Amino acid sequence: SRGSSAGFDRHITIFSPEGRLYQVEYAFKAINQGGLTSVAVRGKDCAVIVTQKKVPDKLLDSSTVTHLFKITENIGCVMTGMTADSRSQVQRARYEAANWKYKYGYEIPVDMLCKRIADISQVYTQNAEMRPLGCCMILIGIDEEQGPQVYKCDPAGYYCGFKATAAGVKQTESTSFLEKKVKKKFDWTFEQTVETAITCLSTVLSIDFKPSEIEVGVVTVENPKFRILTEAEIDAHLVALAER
Amino acid sequence: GYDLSASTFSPDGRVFQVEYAMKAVENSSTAIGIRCKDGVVFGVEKLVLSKLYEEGSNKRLFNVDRHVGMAVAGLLADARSLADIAREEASNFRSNFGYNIPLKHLADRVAMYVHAYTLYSAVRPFGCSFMLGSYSVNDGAQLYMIDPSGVSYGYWGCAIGKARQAAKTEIEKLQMKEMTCRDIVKEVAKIIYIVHDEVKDKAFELELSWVGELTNGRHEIVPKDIREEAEKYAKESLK
Amino acid sequence: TTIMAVQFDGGVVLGADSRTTTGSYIANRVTDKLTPIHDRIFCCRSGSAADTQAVADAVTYQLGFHSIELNEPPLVHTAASLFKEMCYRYREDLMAGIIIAGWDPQEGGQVYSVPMGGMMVRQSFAIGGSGSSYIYGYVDATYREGMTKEECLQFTANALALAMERDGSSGGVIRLAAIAESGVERQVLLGDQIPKFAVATL
Amino acid sequence: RGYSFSLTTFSPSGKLVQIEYALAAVAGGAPSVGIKAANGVVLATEKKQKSILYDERSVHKVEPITKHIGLVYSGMGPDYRVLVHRARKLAQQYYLVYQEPIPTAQLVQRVASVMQEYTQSGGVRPFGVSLLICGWNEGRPYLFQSDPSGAYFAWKATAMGKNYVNGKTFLEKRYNEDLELEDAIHTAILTLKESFEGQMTEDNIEVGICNEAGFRRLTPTEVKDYLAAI
Amino acid sequence: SRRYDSRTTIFSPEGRLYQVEYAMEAIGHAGTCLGILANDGVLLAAERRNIHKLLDEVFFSEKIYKLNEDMACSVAGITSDANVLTNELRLIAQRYLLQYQEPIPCEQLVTALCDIKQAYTQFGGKRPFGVSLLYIGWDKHYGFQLYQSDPSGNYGGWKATCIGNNSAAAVSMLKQDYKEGEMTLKSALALAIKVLNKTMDVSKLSAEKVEIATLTRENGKTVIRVLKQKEVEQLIKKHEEEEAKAER
Amino acid sequence: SIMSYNGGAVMAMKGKNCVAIAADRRFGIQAQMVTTDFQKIFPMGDRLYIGLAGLATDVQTVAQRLKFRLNLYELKEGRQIKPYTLMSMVANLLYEKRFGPYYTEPVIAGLDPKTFKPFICSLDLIGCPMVTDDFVVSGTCAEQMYGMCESLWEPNMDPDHLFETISQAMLNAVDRDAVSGMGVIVHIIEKDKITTRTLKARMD
Amino acid sequence: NQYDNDVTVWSPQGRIHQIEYAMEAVKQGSATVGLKSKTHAVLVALKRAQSELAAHQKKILHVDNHIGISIAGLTADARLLCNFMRQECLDSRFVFDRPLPVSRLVSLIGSKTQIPTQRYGRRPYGVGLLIAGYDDMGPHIFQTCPSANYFDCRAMSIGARSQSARTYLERHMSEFMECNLNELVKHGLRALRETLPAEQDLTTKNVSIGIVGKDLEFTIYDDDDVSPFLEGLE
Amino acid sequence: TTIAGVVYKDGIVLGADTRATEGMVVADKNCSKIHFISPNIYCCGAGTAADTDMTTQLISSNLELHSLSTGRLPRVVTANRMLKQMLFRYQGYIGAALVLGGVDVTGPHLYSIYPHGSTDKLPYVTMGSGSLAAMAVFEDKFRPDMEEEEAKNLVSEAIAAGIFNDLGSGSNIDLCVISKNKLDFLRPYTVPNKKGTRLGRYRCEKGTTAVLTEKITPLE
């Protein structure tokens, strides 16, 4: 023990002598290969997802570079990590939701959709012949009783609902920033939710964004349909922040 | 070693088999696509490895639907197989939904197929990158590129293969948003001649195709007379 | 059953009676036969209620999924094509006569018939169900190219009322829907709101 | 296709080391405790709950299988969710045939059998969890553990996860046969406090109880109340 | 995938099957389990490993399993594996009964299970079951019977035997005390206790630490009973009284 | 009718702390009697019996396949099956053949193995259960049986009165049915014993 | 090395050693030549004889009235592929009542032979073909490889010492289009003859010829039937 | 069989008779036709008895798995979809004709479900051989937004109509009342039919039945 290894325990998902799954651990490192960080925050009225948008190449059609995805009309997501893996997972999520509605006659709850994707990821941690997906999914939606929801699932098949969370390169620093900010807040709950998200991202990256360098997605209690902010909309938040 | 299977991550979170497949594309000669005002133009530096081969042998430009061209780099047998997958996907879409597959959806579907070959010891990743181009009045000009990992993005201009960077830097000089397909073909040819290493690889054929307002949204080979004029312009421009 | 739809400049009007029968028992007198398949695409159902409900649910699933993937509203033509594929493929195990109508940004208001057997044809206006027999002459004589929305609504309500008077297997209330870029407007004509045409006494 | 060979095999010395190594994942898991009182059963577990950012109510470690049976675990959470789902499905399969709720022991046997499969069947590793399963049937409480090999054991009281050896000796010197359920809840929470670290709140432990009326999680407010004494 | 396949079902260079051997090492470390045949019956006696103070005691035994009306078994080795095999034994015995409308003869049930064990050593690429079993029974062809099987799919009939911890020592003591054709259930019981007393040398023998089942015939019916703790202490008492006689 | 190819009749009846189950003894093929000692009532526990009328081959198959399942259950579970649970097991066995059923319609009679409470039920051929507090009947003379039971049965009968009632209900019912009879067997089930009798009965 | 045993394992240079190794099976086969004019497509093959008393291995195979092949590499793989081609041709005549166009058949070969290069536990085909055909687009010579790539050729040679045959063919290929049939087969023979050790010669025992064209279904010439073509190598 | 349901101001009232027949004989005088689906959802069944029992049990079990998973009270639409999709698949060979009622987060809902898989969502419905008698009562007397006791009166009247006018129906009236706050499973609600009493006695004394053979087997 302390980093020990036997047999094929670094190549396939079998247990190491401490009871670790190295291949799963390595899938978490794959999430950072992309170089990106995402933040998600929930208040009483809305839930928001913010991620970096990096378009290094001028020759890209930047309208096709996104990590924000509509899963259903009412469920949005931000993907962090290996892009093709992410897209696959988005497709599976879309399929699971559509299937749920066909079978059960009501929209899949965000928590259930997150659980389902996490359960599918679990299988890759126990069966030897395929790798985990090197990506992480953050879901937002409005639940009719519990309000705005933020859920995250990961390549180990863990999942959880959150007040706020993050993913990718600056996840730890985002988590620190968000913790420090909720403790301050009465009944431990975020109120300025889009500002917290952008501010968190800007602090941990040290950037001060242009409106073309982030993407923002939202769901609200008054407007549950998932919506992607335009550049001008995002600019209005950037300018409102810059002015105090 | 951590680089033998697409179902094994390295300790840093890489999938080396996918990276190795990318190296096969990167050893290949260069293909480019450019989207412009009224369509998309493709060009390939098609190395001729024997004089015994016919003109046109080992095409790297394919029709995958009547409105969709495909331009490839990498292992050619893998690319052709992907062209068959693309064809089947476009065909099935028409049968099921009753209209021509939108470019983006076709790109996303074939990309997921490519992606499926990056998860498993049972199969290997495709050793090819490919561009898809189309044009319609409703959707305009669209150019997508898909790599061995299964990532898919849209482009104004794109290049794949061994002189990729040199090609991109030449493509960046064009104001392609304001140019027509007829103007762009010449510039495609020009750029293939620029990035071609006449010392290291001796003989090539220029392959050109396009889809745009001028072909009524059909992907077609550039006519012979227009290709020859574009070559002559590229060659004289090299001077 | 009697079902109908009519195209106008900018949208469509759909209608149906509300009678469901087992033999000559009325098992539902206020049936809703106009079922939403997407935001601006409806189908009018006739034939087996089990069949048309199962088929409509399935198409709703397929179209919704397709629509999310494309990130665009779906084509009316696509909805009709999905009905057709399923109605044709399973023509030996289904009794379904469908009209698909709606609006999309590309082609505007559109009406498609998918009658039993699973052919598909676009029409200016369409009728179906058992009661349609009794209104071919009426719709043939009354239809005019270029009717407004309000005229399409009246023409529909009249046609359906006439069918309903004569067809034992049609009746109850008239359900109407108009579909356009702005949305879907539904209403019910009941009792004295149904158009009335005297019995011809001596 | 799927790998068709076993990933767990005998070592020369007769050990199934993948199952041992699964047990090491269990031992490193968060602590869980179960105590069988005279009139009921309590299951209690520590939440490995970092951050105030977690919504503690969003996922549960103490879970209902049926009206009369519930579970907790130590080890790998996602593996546990698999077994919770199968246990539920097993219970319903039984109910459809027999029209009687599955006896706790029968439910344990069928779940344990699934865990055994994953020690032999092709291309899979064992589950990295041990389960504590409580129930009430034939007018009487039951507490069982099921381990990654598929072995199961009936306990009066036990502990699993981090620091379980100590937890077990803490319960030896504290459990009595004639103990009531409410006292048992108190002693279960004290057993967690032996290895806690961090100050206990009603949000970072989870408690389930089982008696004649059925299985249920205690609510945050009920847990808060038991915590005042501790 | 050829790289990861540990090849459980192949020969080694001396014509050995390593897994089978290794599984046999697992068994040799498990709880001692003996079987003794008498004129009026057959018995099983086993070391309990479920002995911690906080255990609950909910079934009628730990390692003795009823197979059908006329047969029981005990096991030494991987418990979960034993649960699979004993479930399969019960199935086989009901399949027979369904088909022929008479109880499966003892040797036929053993052989059917042993054929499953054998398959696992020859094809399918899986680890064998890490279980040895002792089977006790009555049938109308050979009366009272005792069988032993191991992970090779091999089995044999015995008048007395032992599997599990200290087997070799237990068999020696059996070889010496067992009276072929002259044992009763009462003297087999005494002998079982004598043997466990020597072979549980970690440490001083107690009723909480052993399980004994008897198989007898009463009025044309097989009776299979697990002795209560009162009876087990009495036999332990009697053996300890007996060793007081041992010198004078 | 498939159900009358063999003829036959079974019934069960509840008394105070006891139950009774009875059957005719004929095995015949349409008009032809083949034997007069054909078993239709089978033990499923010390205090739990199942009676099957209908097609003789399915009477035997169901009894046998049921025993298979029950024996496995009892070995796996601690214990003797409860009457209500036996019913459910049988229902599930019959409904598996929903679209090609066994042609048999059983009655069950017993006492709960722990409480000794009386239980009786019957099922149709696809496994629909019916529990009653008085009697159940199944076979080619069900009308006749109903008429006798409705008229004679009373609540809370002692074992002797239960035996006379079920005996008179069977004998008189089968004597109006060409394809049932050739003897009657009756089991009375009590906490501490089973009493098995064959009745003096018409043999035509 | 760790990279050369599985067709599914890319090397760090972007190569697949199992496919390269399969191509060595063709390089070690006996040489064959294929060439075309405006009107005919010809195959010429050297047959290797095991002993001095063995017949000489068949190199040239009939596929359909309009298509024949020459092979180099594993003979069993050659037959498997040849049987696939035959069946594809029969299918097309059954369905459409017309010959399968040659370029389409070669496409089908590429697609069929690519599949095992991408699946674990499968292997490439260890054979290369020269394909002579005649259809509405005139005569063809195609070449197929274990890599599943294929080529449309003015002329070609594969097999042992085929470099020499390729050189000869480049030297004279501007003459081929206008050649009458005798001339064209003579060219095929002269090219093939360059592959031989200097002692040795083309004989009726070692040469096999296949010809198809506008007037002529795919026909194989062996033994005494090659003599007309061998005399007047003047 | 006569089964029915109504939507009232605060909930659902379901109703059923208690006769089962085999041919034109009464097999059960007291069978239970109002089947549990979930704590907030019940379903009356008519048609082939084993099919109604088995269908409702299966869906109830799948719904319990669903609700265990979601942690939420199930929806009536979900039971409706699951029933109708299964019945459709079987093409009418599962002869279950159902009245499904409950109260969920969206309030009260009532559906009729036919063997071939069609469903109708309506404020009152009837099914079974007695369904026209019960429907006549509803058409004549139903009002929207009845109070609990009025709704229970109307449903029992409607079941009574089937009991007395349909040879397939009889014996008792069972009701189930479901609201946001309450589940009242009223079995029996009314017992409008009773066996007349017996005028003569046939208490046949020991020895009346002649016995050929006897075996007593003592038990533990």
Ligand SMILES: [Cl-]
């Ligand atoms: Cl849907």
Ligand SMILES: [Cl-]
């Ligand atoms: Cl805030």
Ligand SMILES: [Cl-]
């Ligand atoms: Cl590239």
Ligand SMILES: [Cl-]
């Ligand atoms: Cl309908």
Ligand SMILES: [Cl-]
């Ligand atoms: Cl029609």
Ligand SMILES: [Cl-]
């Ligand atoms: Cl129609």
Ligand SMILES: [Cl-]
């Ligand atoms: Cl109709």
Ligand SMILES: [Cl-]
């Ligand atoms: Cl009506």
Ligand SMILES: [Cl-]
């Ligand atoms: Cl395998």
Ligand SMILES: [Cl-]
């Ligand atoms: Cl679950």
Ligand SMILES: [Cl-]
């Ligand atoms: Cl349950």
Ligand SMILES: [Cl-]
């Ligand atoms: Cl709970």
Ligand SMILES: [Cl-]
């Ligand atoms: Cl048995």
Ligand SMILES: [Cl-]
């Ligand atoms: Cl037996």
Ligand SMILES: [Cl-]
């Ligand atoms: Cl069976």
Ligand SMILES: [Cl-]
């Ligand atoms: Cl060769």
